[PDB]
C-alpha cells in the first residue's frame, strides 16, 4: 500500500540522517570508506563480511533496510570486523577498536532517544507480512 510504501521511506531518512551524523564525526573517517586493497591486501581476504558507512548509505538508497533491527546489524558489523581485523595490543590497533566500538555505541544510542518503538513494531510487522 501506499501507507507502507510511505513507513519505508520514513525509516529510510531515519537511517539516512543517523548514517550522516556518523559519517560527519572526525573519531569515525576511518569507517565511511571501503579498506583500499592496494594498501590492506589482506583485508578483502579474512574480512569476508566488508561494511562501512558508504556502503550503509548505498544500503538504505536500495531499500534493503525495512527494520532498524537489519541496519543495527550492518552497525554491528562495522564494529565486530574492527575488532577481529585490529585485535593487537598496539596503540594503533587500541585506537581504531575504540572508535568501532564509539561507532557503534552512539548509533544505538541515537536510536535509542530518537526512533519510536511503535514506529519500528510496525515496521516489524509490515516486513513479517511479505
Ligand atoms: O534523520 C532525521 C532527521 C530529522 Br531533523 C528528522 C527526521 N529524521
Ligand atoms: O567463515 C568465515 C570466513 C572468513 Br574469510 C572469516 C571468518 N569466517
Ligand atoms: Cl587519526
Redo the contacts with the bound molecule.
Keep these: 500500500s501506499m501507507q507502507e510504501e510511505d513507513t519505508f521511506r520514513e525509516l529510510r531518512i531515519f537511517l539516512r540522517n543517523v548514517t550522516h551524523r556518523l559519517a560527519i564525526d572526525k573519531r569515525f573517517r576511518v569507517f565511511t570508506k571501503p579498506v583500499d586493497p592496494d594498501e590492506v591486501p589482506d583485508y578483502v581476504?579474512?574480512?569476508?563480511?566488508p561494511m562501512d558507512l558508504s556502503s550503509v548509505i548505498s544500503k538504505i538508497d536500495l531499500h534493503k533496510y525495512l527494520t532498524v533491527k537489519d541496519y543495527l546489524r550492518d552497525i554491528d558489523l562495522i564494529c565486530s570486523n574492527a575488532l577481529?581485523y585490529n585485535p593487537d595490543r598496539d596503540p594503533g590497533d587500541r585506537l581504531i577498536r575504540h572508535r568501532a566500538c564509539a561507532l557503534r555505541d552512539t548509533a544505538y544510542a541515537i536510536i535509542k532517544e530518537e526512533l519510536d518503538e511503535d514506529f519500528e513494531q510496525l515496521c516489524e510487522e509490515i516486513q513479517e507480512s511479505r
Design positions: 581476504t579474512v574480512i569476508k563480511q577481529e
